[PDB]
Design goal:
The complex is a heterodimer. By secondary structure, chain A is an alpha+beta fold. Chain A folds into 2 domains: 210 residues, Transferase(Phosphotransferase), domain 1 (Orthogonal Bundle), CATH 1.10.510; 125 residues, Phosphorylase Kinase, domain 1 (2-Layer Sandwich). In chain A, 33% of the residues lie in helices and 14% in strands. In chain A, the strands form 3 sheets. Chain A has a 5-stranded antiparallel β-sheet. In chain A, a hairpin with a 5-residue loop joins strand 7 and strand 8. In chain A, helix 5 runs antiparallel to helix 7. The longest helix of chain A has 20 residues. Chain A is globular. Chain A starts with a helix and ends in a 44-residue tail after the last helix. Chain B is mainly alpha-helical. In chain B, 30% of the residues lie in helices and 0% in strands. Chain B contains 1 helix and no strands. The longest helix of chain B is centred in the N-terminal third of the chain and has 6 residues. The chains are: A alpha+beta, B mainly alpha. The interface between A and B is medium-sized, with 31 and 15 residues. The structure holds adenosine-5'-diphosphate and magnesium ion (MG) (2 copies). One magnesium ion binds next to loops of chain A. Chain A: One of its GO terms (biological process) is cellular response to heat. Chain A: It is an enzyme of class 2 (transferase). Chain A: It catalyses: L-seryl-[protein] + ATP = O-phospho-L-seryl-[protein] + ADP + H(+); L-threonyl-[protein] + ATP = O-phospho-L-threonyl-[protein] + ADP + H(+). Chain A: Belongs to the protein kinase superfamily. AGC Ser/Thr protein kinase family. cAMP subfamily. Chain A: Pfam families: Pkinase.
């Protein structure tokens, strides 16, 4: 009855997709403490909510920047989708609002930091440790794809570790609701599926490619296609030859061969049995898919926490003022936000 | 080694997106 659960999940999503929440807070309800990470657009700050005393992660987007990088539709997508979804490994959007200059998305603060820093620091993850996270993405993409959502920015930088050691997916800036095919060249070069790179028109299968990249990077400690410049990377991806570390298990290599499959007719996640080809692969034979959904599996790694507003699992960033003009910018563009 | 070549490369930090 995954079928049953997904059906009612869809009902719930559609209600919110159709009547999105709006304007549920304002900037002066929060004290801005420290930047937690920057993206390509705007920054995420640790903040304290005055009346509750709760900490959150406030994503701040400058409207004029959003316009300048042609991200208007993407940003409306981002917020419209994030406020409507509900899943154990998706970060929670707690508030949203806008002012003359900026767009604000307030999420639950996930204090364990990025998978990225942990991965670079440790070097690589054991196969059981990688499998534990991968399982969570598999379930998440099952959910998202069932709602006709493509995610399109899977990477360690956008996966957060929580206080239980489970994953929280963040950054829906490239997420999109679509049946069938879309064409936007967007994502992160190391993670692009070859059909994106080749301007084909692509679908939801690009997320299963990216999962392959993720599992490889997690277990190898470096990505399957790397180079000094994006062009060089896309070359490698299109050529499609992949080499594996000597320590990769046979099971892992076979799975990765079915995910990093240039042939859409052959890529796992995509076919007849759908996700089942992935859930039933030998590499996941020891995965208890229900227990994972239920968060009953003991995490292989639990970050150190030093209370409420500890940001020690995050790098430091140079701080900048957050200006709010006395004139409203891009009012029409962002009306539904 | 592959690792050595990655580590010496310019893409070992947080990666930017494209939309390009
Ligand atoms: N809920 C959160 N809790 C803690 N830190 C977060 C949270 N969301 C984002 N961050 C940090 O801020 C960074 C940027 O967020 P993101 O949504 O990815 O912005 P962009 O879309 O511009 O990449 C993340 O990579 C992470 O370091
Ligand atoms: Mg991001
Ligand atoms: Mg983004």
């Amino acid at each position: 009855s995954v079928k049953e659960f997904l059906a009612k999940a869809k009902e719930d999503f559609l209600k919110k997709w159709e009547t999105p929440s709006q304007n549920t807070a304002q900037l002066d309800q929060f004290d801005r403490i420290k930047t937690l990470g920057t993206g390509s657009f705007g920054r995420v700050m640790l903040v304290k909510h005055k009346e509750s005393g709760n900490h959150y992660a406030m994503k701040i987007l400058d409207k004029q920047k959003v316009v300048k990088l042609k991200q208007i539709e993407h940003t409306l997508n981002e917020k419209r989708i994030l406020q409507a979804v509900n899943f154990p490994f998706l970060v929670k959007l707690e508030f949203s609002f806008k002012d003359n200059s900026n767009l604000y998305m307030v999420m639950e603060y996930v204090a364990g930091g990025e998978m990225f820093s942990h991965l670079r620091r440790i070097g690589r993850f054991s196969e059981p440790h990688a499998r534990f996270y991968a399982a969570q993405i598999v379930l998440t993409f099952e959910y998202l794809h069932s709602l006709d959502l493509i995610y399109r920015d899977l990477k360690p930088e956008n996966l957060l570790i929580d206080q239980q050691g489970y994953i929280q997916v963040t950054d829906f800036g490239f997420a999109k609701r679509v049946k069938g095919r879309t064409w936007t060249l967007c994502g992160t070069p190391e993670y692009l599926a070859p059909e994106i790179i080749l301007s084909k028109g692509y679908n939801k299968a690009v997320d299963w490619w990216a999962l392959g990249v993720l599992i490889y990077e997690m277990a190898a400690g470096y990505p399957p296609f790397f180079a000094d410049q994006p062009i060089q990377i896309y070359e490698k991806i299109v050529s499609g030859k992949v080499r594996f570390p000597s320590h990769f298990s046979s099971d892992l290599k076979d799975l990765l061969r079915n995910l990093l499959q240039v042939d859409l007719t052959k890529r796992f996640g995509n076919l007849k049995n759908g996700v089942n080809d992935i859930k039933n692969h030998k590499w996941f034979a020891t995965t208890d898919w229900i227990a994972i959904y239920q968060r009953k599996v003991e995490a292989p790694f639990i970050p150190k926490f030093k209370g409420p507003g500890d940001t020690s699992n995050f790098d430091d960033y140079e701080e900048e003022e957050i200006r709010v003009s006395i004139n409203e910018k891009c009012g029409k563009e962002f009306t539904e936000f | 080694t592959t690792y050595a070549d990655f580590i010496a490369s310019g893409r070992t930090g947080r990666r930017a997106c494209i939309h390009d």
